[PDB]
Amino acid sequence: RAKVERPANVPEDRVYEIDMYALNGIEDGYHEAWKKVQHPGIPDLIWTPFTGGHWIATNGDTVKEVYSDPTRFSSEVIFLPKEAGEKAQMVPTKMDPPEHTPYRKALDKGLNLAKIRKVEDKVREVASSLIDSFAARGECDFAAEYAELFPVHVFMALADLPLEDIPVLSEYARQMTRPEGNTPEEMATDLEAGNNGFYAYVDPIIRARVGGDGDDLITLMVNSEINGERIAHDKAQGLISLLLLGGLDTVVNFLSFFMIHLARHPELVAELRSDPLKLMRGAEEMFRRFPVVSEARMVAKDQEYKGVFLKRGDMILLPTALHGLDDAANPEPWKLDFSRRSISHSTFGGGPHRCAGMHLARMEVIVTLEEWLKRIPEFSFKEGETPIYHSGIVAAVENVPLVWPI
């Protein structure tokens, strides 16, 4: 709808009509729609009048570079449109170093690789138990009956929460991650129901776990220090909330993306079923091939970049799809190749905000896939059905009916 007028720093030949929430051809798939943007010869930085007017990085080299220099490209605003964000600070996602660092250090206590190794059995239980619920059926909607459920069940185990509380957490997760609907007033109220609901829910748990010896995410966050002192109660609520939301919409959609693909590549499934080690070693490959995030950075100071003069406060969208699927970075990028030697992507971003959850994500994906093939070694996508895609900050897909012999 709303277009802004081309600013004086945007040359006419960098103008593309791209709506990140409604990509041309999104119905035929999210990755294909982004790739359709990245035509041969496209400049490294283009600009669109939609969503407030913003630049877009169009290949792996540019995505990487904008991601990794907070002095030039700040997380002061990371969400498009620039008015959305945007008051709520969701600490530390909008901080630059050094402010960012000790908040990230608190996140890392719950998510580091050594720590994640020790939760593998709990994640495997979530996955085998979800799958058991439907393996005997010979069909399921992968998205609604596994993907949507899995992150929340993982979070309960990692944050040591009663499984009984799934419905109330699920409701607040819906509200917090995809607010609805009719007016700006309506969406704000909806989001606040999510955010403030989750806030009341975790409050006493925070207080009970101060001084505690559990190694669940909540004890670890609330007992963290920030510049020499125990973290403020509210900051800790913010980290806990971030732990919940960081691993939710990304993982929900990512899991359906790769399952859609495996559903339509039985030979590849055969290959993985036969080489468990190749399966385990190929998480990076799946992350490259199915990136889901398009956050942004704000130009931190006036500066020349990629042939244009950028102004402080301009935004650059970083569609991470355009790194993993970039053929200048990964030859024959459409192939999910478990033997690929050099797997270049920014699916977890880059620089200091590079996904704190990336070790948990790898283990969730591998464990899901192992636990799936144990029970359901052969499977396909239901005849006469198609997935339904949306683009946005996080790529969305649903309707993943899969079927298997029984």
**CB closer to ligand HEM, 30 vs 348:** 348
* Phi, psi (degrees; rounded to nearest 5) at 205: -70, -40
Please report, as a single letter, which amino acid is at residue 114: A
Which residues, including other chains, have CB under 8 Å from residue 199's CB and lie 6 or more apart? 237, 241
Per CB under 6 A, which of residues 246..275 are in contact with ligand HEM?
A: 246-247, 250-251, 254
Q: Which of 353, 372, 381, 401 binds ligand HEM (CB under 6 A)?
A: 353
Q: Three-state SS for 298?
A: strand
Phi-psi group of 43: left, alpha or beta (phi > 0 → left; psi -120 to 50 → alpha; rest → beta) = beta
Q: Supply the minimum distance, in Å, between the C-beta of residue 246 and ligand HEM.
A: 3
**Which of these segments, 33-41, 129-137, 176-184, 289-297, binds ligand HEM (CB under 6 A)?**
289-297
Residue 242 near ligand HEM by CB under 6 A: yes
**CB closer to ligand HEM, 269 vs 293:** 293
Q: What is the dihedral of CA 298, 304, 310, 313, to 10 degrees?
A: 40
103 in a labelled binding site: no
140 in a labelled binding site: no
* Phi, psi (degrees; rounded to nearest 5) at 389: -110, 150
**CB closer to ligand HEM, 51 vs 93:** 93
Residue least distant from ligand HEM (Cβ): 357
Q: How many Å apart are CA 196 and CA 111, to the nearest integer?
A: 25
Residue 371 near ligand HEM by CB under 6 A: no
Residue 361 near ligand HEM by CB under 6 A: yes
Residues that bind ligand HEM (CB under 6 A): 75, 78, 92-93, 104, 107, 242-243, 246-247, 250-251, 254, 292-293, 295, 320, 347-349, 353, 355-357, 360-361
Residue numbers in the known binding site for heme b are 67, 104, 297, 353, 355
Residue numbers in the known binding site are 67, 104, 297, 353, 355
